[PDB]
Design a protein around this ligand. Structure first.
Ligand SMILES: COc1ccc(-c2noc(C(=O)O)c2[C@H](C)O)cc1
Ligand SMILES: COc1ccc(-c2noc(C(=O)O)c2[C@H](C)O)cc1
Ligand SMILES: COc1ccc(-c2noc(C(=O)O)c2[C@H](C)O)cc1
Length: 340
């Protein structure tokens, strides 16, 4: 790599480590915000649009029920999520603005990205052209270069986690499975269609699982469906471990070649995990037209700008039953979440 890239990554790691070793805590409280709308809901958490009462700024507030986090064995993962988010800084990562906890819940207050999930847009139009897929893919390549340099594995790449901003660029959200890992790690996590073979086979695995997931994402953007699709998890897993893939005839030869090298079952032969690291991806013929500096600087005109009316518009997200944010009179799970 050029000295300029080496010096940029060295500064990025220094700045990350300073916040990683001394994390911020307790930087807001719940009654500083008005609740507007639920934007999504899961097994132990929800995300809600909120407005700060004094400044009028909008934010996306992720709320985790401490008792449910414990029951679903996510304690370490939720502590990882907040400690990583308060320490990172990159153009294609959603920014954490505040965090706090109370007797019942954990709270992460993010910037709100009003354009919606990539997934919605992809499903509405069917598939993206190769230039359109390549613009988003280039942003993920740079983001993974940054995260991997800091010894972070992301472990949750999928179209639902890629939000489209007011300039039509990507911001990656949901660090619930992200982890600082210097060698190998072992937890079964991720979404079925995006899992690498070594995760499915219960091996010790490393950052190469993110590069496999990038191959699944590029395939899905350019085709409209993921490569290993099937009706039940066990059948998806059989396809993933098999070492074969079928490509639509509309794919270019360069796209097919790049995907065979990212979707390589043998992790020791997979692009992103060879001696030249990310440069085997950046220098591939499919990326020959990509100006990497111009993408990082946000100087390239985006394929499209999402339609929305302003920073409070929720029209690009869907509708959920609205439930209370109740806070108990007794502290739950205080020892488990001391460091949050
Ligand atoms: C992983 O993401 C990166 C973004 C950017 C750089 C970078 N590499 O060289 C320069 C330069 O200043 O010439 C830069 C930025 C624009 O400062 C490197 C990596
Ligand atoms: C940053 O702005 C956001 C908007 C929406 C969400 C969201 N709402 O429900 C599920 C999510 C993401 C995919 O985890 C998160 C952040
Ligand atoms: C240049 O090629 C494009 C492909 C796709 C889109 C697109 N992706 O999602 C939507 C949506 O309506 O959600 C659209 C447009 C605005 O209709 C835009 C441009």
């Amino acid at each position: 790599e050029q000295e300029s890239v080496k010096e940029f990554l060295a500064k990025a790691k220094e700045e990350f480590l300073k916040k990683w070793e001394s994390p911020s805590q307790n930087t807001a409280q719940l009654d500083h915000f008005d609740r507007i709308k639920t934007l999504g809901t899961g097994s132990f958490g929800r995300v809600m649009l909120v407005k700060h009462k004094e400044t009028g700024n909008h934010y996306a507030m992720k709320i985790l029920d401490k008792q449910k986090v414990v029951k679903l064995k996510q304690i370490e993962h939720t502590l990882n999520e907040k400690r990583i988010l308060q320490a990172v800084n990159f153009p294609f990562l959603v920014k954490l603005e505040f965090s706090f906890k109370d007797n019942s819940n954990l709270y992460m207050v993010m910037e709100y990205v009003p354009g919606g999930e990539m997934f919605s847009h992809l499903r509405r139009i069917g598939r993206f052209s190769e230039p359109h897929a390549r613009f988003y893919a280039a942003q993920i390549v740079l983001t993974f270069e940054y995260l991997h340099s800091l010894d972070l594995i992301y472990r949750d790449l999928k179209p639902e986690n890629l939000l489209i901003d007011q300039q039509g660029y990507i911001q990656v959200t949901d660090f619930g499975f992200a982890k600082r890992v210097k060698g190998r790690t072992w937890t079964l996590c991720g979404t079925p269609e995006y899992l690498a073979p070594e995760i499915i086979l219960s091996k010790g695995y490393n950052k190469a699982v993110d590069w496999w997931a990038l191959g699944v994402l590029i395939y899905e953007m350019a085709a409209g469906y993921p490569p290993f699709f099937a009706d039940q998890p066990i059948q998806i897993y059989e396809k993933i471990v098999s070492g074969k893939v079928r490509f639509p005839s509309h794919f270019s030869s360069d796209l097919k070649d790049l995907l065979r090298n990212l979707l390589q079952v043998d992790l020791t032969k997979r692009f992103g995990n060879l001696k030249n690291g990310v440069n085997d991806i950046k220098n591939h013929k499919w990326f020959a037209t990509t100006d990497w500096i111009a993408i990082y600087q946000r100087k390239v005109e985006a394929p499209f700008i999402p339609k929305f009316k302003g920073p409070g518009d929720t029209s690009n997200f869907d509708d959920y039953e609205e439930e209370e944010i109740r806070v108990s009179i007794n502290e739950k799970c205080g020892k488990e979440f001391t460091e949050f």
